[PDB]
Amino acid sequence: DFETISSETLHTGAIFALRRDQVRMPGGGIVTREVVEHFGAVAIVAMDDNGNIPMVYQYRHTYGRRLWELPAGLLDVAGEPPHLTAARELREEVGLQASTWQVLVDLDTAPGFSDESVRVYLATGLREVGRPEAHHEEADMTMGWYPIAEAARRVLRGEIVNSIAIAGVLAVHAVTTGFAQPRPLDTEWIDRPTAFAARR
């Protein structure tokens, strides 16, 4: 079922495209299904030798306020491998470098209307290296180190609400409590976006 009958691009912006598709429903009808094409992104849970991780306080215009989040960046560099996008962004945002990288959790942010998918890595064996000069939203953001457990409590207390940070924080929390294990970098990323990047 669910066959796409027609695709019409309604808008192409800086980081996503708006597309309206006509989809055939179970009953036999046809409906509007609008999708927001997104580059996709990556985030990093950089855990240090004592179980602490870095988070950034970044202003989000969508909410008109700053949220506590994990270091993260868009896959807006055509051809750049995701784990490189991760390492690059970790260094730029929290000035860190890691000797070990594994896959923590992948999340599909808003399945209802966007194809954006985000891969969260767990970076260990941390090294403090230089951080570049930031621009825009990043020139305003700050950071703080949190024990994974407190970070986990912050989520359950509503102090952390960014879906990417929630997933990574609770996922690493499950790992540090011995409930689960990290995963190989070559783990399949089923829903990694391709549409918007494919546009150009």
What's the token pair of residue 70?
Answer: 């994990």
- Candidates 81, 112, 125, 132; binder of ligand ADV (CB under 6 A) is 112
Which of 128, 137, 138, 159 is an active site residue? 138
Known binding residue 138? Answer is yes
**Within 10 A of 139 (CB to CB), how many other CB atoms are there?**
8
Residue among 90, 160, 156 at smallest CA distance from 121: 90
Q: Is 138 marked active-site?
A: yes
Place of tokens 């070990």: 100
Cβ atoms of 70 and 79 within 8 Å: the answer is no
Residue among 41, 34, 75 at smallest CA distance from 162: 41
Known binding residue 72? Answer is yes
Three-state SS at 168? helix
Window 160-199: residues binding ligand ADV (CB under 6 A): none
Q: Is 78 among the residues that bind its own copies (CB under 8 A)?
A: no
Three-state SS at 34? strand
**Within 10 A of 178 (CB to CB), how many other CB atoms are there?**
7
Q: Is 73 among the residues that bind Mn ion (CB under 5 A)?
A: yes
Window 28-87: residues binding ligand ADV (CB under 6 A): 32-34, 41, 72-74
- Candidates 4, 12, 57, 113; binder of ligand ADV (CB under 6 A) is 113
Smallest separation, CB 92 to Mn ion (Å): 6
Residue 150, contacted partner among ligand ADV, its own copies, Mn ion, none, CB below 5-8 A by kind: none
Residues making up the binding site = 72, 89, 93, 138
Q: Which residues bind ligand ADV (CB under 6 A)?
A: 14-15, 32-34, 41, 72-74, 89, 112-113, 135-138
